[PDB]
Symmetry: D2
Subunit: 344 residues, 4 copies
């Protein structure tokens, strides 16, 4: 088995396992877990923010941010293919009572003039626009990197209208590794940033939200309500400190593996665009195959390669710490074998 | 003052005023208002449905329909410029806890394959898609008529998947007058239809939802929750019975006046597309004007013509019973005057 | 028939029917209905508040008040048998996402020390308490009057904790007639008051909320979201102006008729307590009867008297404009015949 | 320092820490974490239910159960002092749009006849009662045990009305230990039970919900929505398996320590009722003391004992694994020195 379904599947390193076992813990409901308290201090420091909040998932990170940013009946501008809108169970509507206002982007980049256009006038008929969300990297387009200049302009548009900005930075360090832009400088154009520890950085559980002391307080109370108020969570935060402080640099290996994997897949004859591979994700089209995305997933699964389809004709391949160059090469040999068996 | 902001501004006819003063009434919360009961019987019968529910507004018509069709956390597929998404205060999210899934359409017509692609798989990350809403006529695109075939194909898609279909037919009679499709035939492809009395049909207050007995029963309890459970509302249903039975045919005059207004406006030189005017609405673009939409509205208001912006660069003109052909002609002179100033 | 189920069954007076007939109307979504505007102005003036908002029901009046007073997650303290909790479809939880905090009272009066104890401290486990609701008269206890001292003390607790007060004054004018306390004085200890036009004051549709202009502005937008933004609603407001200014003082008849009814019912042998009858409601117990509430209601209905059970063993009788002293004396004869048959 | 604020403060045993280091993990979003999978299997088996779901907190455990049990606008009967009502941030209203219906109890036991009268009839005005919640042990009354006969009679009432039952069993194993009722038999009277790993059973994080397969599937989707869908959560589940399988019996020591603590505190002269100490909690009154609860807490803190106020005259001490019999006696001598200073 070679698991290219997601970078979520990453397993803890031996150093994470030791640190978790011997974590200094307390009751986080009293703010007394010291390893939680230090993870949040580090995260706030790293993003140049006042405060930070550990959460058991990126989904909860994003939804406590929406709650702390909005009142009932607000509208939240977000990209039409973004995670908050497609893969968070409609939570923004049920939990926050807010409307998404989807804006089609280009590989994650919403046209700033479209964002401006989507902001609501004050009129009794209209929800109040109170939040613009930006995802970086943008998952559904293939781990694409949103330009810093795009985020900068959207921040400006938001400040000109008294609207908050949230960065869905589930994979923001990947974006940073690919662009050279430090995450402090990304975060300077947002009121809040959620980032995952449990994807490429290899922690077993959870994410962090960074922002103002005011917002984080409101998000901490939203977390209690949603059920993310844990006890001796320092057992998880120990791994998160390691993930945050020791696992960023090596994301470059994931990017190089993903680039090598795409380059070779095109040489075999698969419909991939190696020029589109910016971070740790490859998109493969089934249009020159006699199967669709789902049938190809089954052939791959049967041959020892796990991937997932993202539409009827597209599959997403994701590299991560538990996929070595040797793994990529053994996967390429499987892809090569099946290719004659799957083409049109 | 010539009012082209909306057909909502229609005032009741003297016949309506007399019927309201004489209405036989009861407490609608016990279902004992006979004028309410007769309007709902007439509305169900007109639309081919088992049952109907009077509501104080079209917005409440849409929102009790959504509540009755959905559970918390469902997604509703709707057109990206439809009234439910654009101009109903985010009620579907606040009141029903449901996620809108906007689909950009063409003149209100969502591509049915785009509707199919929007329906969610069974996956834990994904809400359940339980409703598709369609708007006819489509307001924001200029009172455009959604082709019946589009509604047919989307009703087909929904049924394959067990999804309910709501038609926001706030102006469905304008659509019927222009398309020839009887409202009963549109309604056959829907689980529920809301339509307004208080717009082109000149009633002072209210809309009706038509549908199945069970759904209407659920929608009535949603009405009670949202605050639409009134008492002797037969006073309003008396005007509504007249609106439904006596004011439909003269909608062709609003359409003729709208067409005349648009052809003449184009001749003056405004950015209008008369070939797009099929009902009672005209969209005028300001790309060839000194002013934007909001500056033109102010200039028009100054000159005694009331209009409304639908975007930064588009104004909406609406005709109705209280705009006569002479009103249109007088408004065209005003529109003529201000053209040399604003070009 | 004689209808003692509720005072909602009141029919418009001839004066009202005339007023509705020639109401001067406009589109209330533009704030252009001159009769709505006058009704709101008179309502604000009558209660000593900056502004007012007409709504199609008292339920909508309470729920837009709650929405405008609160944010998601807040707690609302309210009497454990109040209408907002018992008879408003759980709307406060669905619409505003707010937690009721029920506090048992004596005939509507929550002990202020229990109110103060129900207020949440600043802790992450706890909702913020943002609203206290007081109902006057109190429906479920039988039209009981909350003493002005109770309102004052609760108002004082509220101001010292930063909490708003809403009076559910659906029947506030019945309370004012019984206690002699003018409605402005009650309303001076609240941030908002909802009062009904469609019960004892005999309008066919509607209630009004009064309060500060900012709150009213918020509640108007909640009204739009809930479906209460109507068009030429001056037709209803015309009746509501007569209800507000001219129908209050004759409420004393309804109280005299209620107590006459209650004294004669006890004399006959029914389990009523006429000393408890302060406004237009009488509660009759079925303890000494062969039937329960629902059984008694069926027998009464079969004999021409409509009443309403309020528990398994309690029934409610409500007097109103359409039940004269003559109507009462007849109903008492039916109650006499029935007593022998059902004791 | 001696921490008597709560049993939530328990730290992982050495064994737990070893298992955490070497837990086999997988991605739980894919159902692929074998240690999670085994914990859920063990939990379902211990309670005699079809399925189980690990969650990051008991708060999430209760709220996903409420979500899976209810539709919007439903009503939930629960005890007026229960955790879901007082200390879960109003989540049932925001997340589920449901109203609580508080029924006061005696030490967590709602009178079954009071649960009867709290159920709603079918009427358009009323929410639908869909859930009854019982808390065992009952926290705010001081860890009292709800009699199994109270649970069986309420289950009986629930089955008679189509109503689901949820047991908030945060401290259910404390109840089983003090009562001799196996948790499997408690669980037989409920559709679902939530119980905490992270209080007295000493795991660092998390709770478990058990119920039927379809319920748990619905609650797993609610978990995803609320943000409790974690990845390699087997690290947490490794300690949870130890908590569930090896930490239950020694809860007897916390009960012994609590009784010993309380008995000796009374000998010293504090206002404690040792007979009321049924599990691991001691309630102490400030009636015979200079200070209120908040004063006494601060004085105990400066002296090296952490405790919590549960009211303005009541304080709560909680025994747990990390309080030895030595810790207890060191705390007793601190309570001695303070007594004259507050008597
Ligand atoms: Ca991971
Ligand atoms: Ca009208
Ligand atoms: Ca009436
Ligand atoms: Ca613990």
């Amino acid at each position: 088995m070679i698991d290219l379904r997601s970078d979520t599947v990453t397993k803890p390193t031996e150093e994470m396992r030791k640190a978790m076992a011997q974590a200094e813990v307390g009751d986080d409901v009293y703010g007394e877990d010291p390893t939680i308290n230090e993870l949040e201090r580090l995260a706030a420091e790293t993003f140049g923010k006042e405060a930070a909040l550990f959460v058991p998932s990126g989904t909860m990170g994003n939804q406590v941010s929406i709650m702390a940013h909005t009142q009932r009946g607000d509208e939240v501008i977000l990209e039409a293919d973004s995670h908050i809108f497609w893969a968070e169970v409609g939570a923004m509507a049920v939990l926050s009572g807010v409307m998404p206002h989807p804006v089609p982007g280009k590989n994650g980049a919403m046209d700033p003039d479209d964002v401006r256009k989507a902001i609501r006038d004050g009129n009794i008929h209209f929800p109040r626009t109170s939040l613009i969300a930006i995802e970086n990297t943008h998952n559904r387009s293939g781990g694409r990197v949103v330009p810093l200049e795009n985020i900068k302009e959207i921040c400006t548009i938001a400040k000109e209208h008294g609207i908050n900005v949230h960065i869905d930075g589930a994979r923001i360090f990947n974006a940073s590794i690919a662009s050279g832009v430090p995450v402090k400088e990304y975060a300077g154009y947002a009121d809040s940033v959620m980032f995952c520890l449990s994807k490429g950085l290899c922690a077993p559980v959870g994410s962090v939200v960074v922002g103002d002391r005011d917002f984080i307080e409101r998000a901490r109370k939203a977390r209690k309500m949603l059920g993310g108020g844990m006890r001796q969570a320092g057992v998880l935060a120990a791994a998160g400190i390691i993930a945050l402080t020791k696992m960023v640099d090596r994301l470059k290996e994931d990017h190089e593996n993903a680039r090598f994997l795409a380059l070779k897949l095109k040489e075999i004859g698969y419909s991939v665009n190696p020029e589109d591979v910016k971070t740790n994700m490859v998109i493969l089209r089934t249009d020159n195959l006699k199967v669709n995305a789902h049938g190809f997933i089954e052939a791959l699964r049967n041959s020892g390669v796990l991937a997932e389809a993202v539409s009827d004709t597209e599959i997403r391949l994701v590299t991560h710490k538990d996929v070595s160059r040797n793994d990529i090469e053994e996967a390429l040999n499987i892809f090569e074998k099946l290719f004659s068996q799957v083409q049109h």
